[PDB]
Design a protein around this nucleic acid. Structure first.
Ligand SMILES: [Mg+2]
Ligand SMILES: [Mg+2]
Ligand SMILES: [Mg+2]
Ligand SMILES: [Mg+2]
Ligand SMILES: [Mg+2]
Ligand SMILES: [Mg+2]
Ligand SMILES: [Mg+2]
Ligand SMILES: [Mg+2]
Ligand SMILES: [Mg+2]
Ligand SMILES: [Mg+2]
Ligand SMILES: [Mg+2]
Length: 190
RNA sequence: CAUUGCCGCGAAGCUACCAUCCGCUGGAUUAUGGCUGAACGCCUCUAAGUCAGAAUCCAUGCUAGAACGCGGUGAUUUCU
């Protein structure tokens, strides 16, 4: 169809600075800073009144309009992640063998070590990505809390811990074992 | 002498899974499982982007070295 103009809104709240040269977006707030290279898209950003940035596609087909609301959602994720921050909570699910996860250092690389998953002698190792801060819940039994600015970094680190603890050669309908994400939320949320 | 006459042992050399030694580790991926995320206010591994991942692939390594591919360097003829 090639719609003439599709357009989206981005609400920049009171503490946030958004800076967009060519298609590289820099979002600065109370929690740090974030950068995305959006040069694969071809949208056009325009600043209206310092609390609002439009993003537009001119003469765009169905897939090109489709990526426009993606670009809105990604910058809003950056804005949320530098104002409220991002926080994931994972619980350990085990039947018989308890799962031992402690935050570990190997050559200054800050891994996550998982011993005794299903009684495996194999120690599993997940590296902590930068920005993600691993926490172990007090007054919740067997909960790991991943916190940081990027929802891309926090959720992929929470994805990597689930993916390393998969169950092999068993019926996974019964062998329900692993570390699963229980909550996707913010840090400064109430 | 017996077309190495025959028999036992027999060094050297060659040799035998009939004897010993030795046979490397990184990256990119497929299937698949994911993250973020629209389309399609929700949902979604996919559309943009991105993670992991096979005995696969491509390197590392190993063999040859273009006899018309290349480089460094040595010496370059007389009482002739
Ligand atoms: Mg599996
Ligand atoms: Mg079986
Ligand atoms: Mg005679
Ligand atoms: Mg004789
Ligand atoms: Mg052999
Ligand atoms: Mg999802
Ligand atoms: Mg895939
Ligand atoms: Mg894709
Ligand atoms: Mg990958
Ligand atoms: Mg190598
Ligand atoms: Mg040659």
């Amino acid at each position: 169809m090639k719609y003439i103009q599709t357009e989206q809104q981005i609400e920049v709240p009171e503490g946030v600075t958004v800076s967009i040269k060519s298609r590289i977006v820099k979002v600065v707030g109370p929690r740090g800073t974030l950068t995305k290279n959006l040069k694969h898209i071809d949208v056009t950003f325009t600043k209206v009144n310092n609390q609002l940035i439009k993003v537009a596609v001119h003469n765009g087909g169905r897939k090109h309009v489709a990526a426009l609301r993606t670009v809105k959602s990604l910058v809003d994720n950056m804005i949320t992640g530098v104002t409220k921050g991002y926080k994931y909570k994972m619980r350990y699910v085990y039947a018989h063998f308890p799962i031992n996860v402690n935050i570990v250092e190997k050559d200054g690389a800050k891994f996550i070590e998982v011993r005794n998953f299903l009684g495996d002698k194999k120690i599993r190792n997940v590296p902590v990505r930068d920005g993600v801060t691993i926490e172990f819940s007090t007054n919740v039994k067997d909960e790991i809390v991943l916190s940081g600015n990027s929802v891309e970094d926090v959720s992929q680190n929470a994805a990597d811990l689930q993916q390393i603890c998969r169950v092999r050669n068993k019926d996974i309908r019964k062998f329900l074992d692993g570390i699963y994400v229980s909550h996707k939320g913010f840090i400064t949320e109430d």
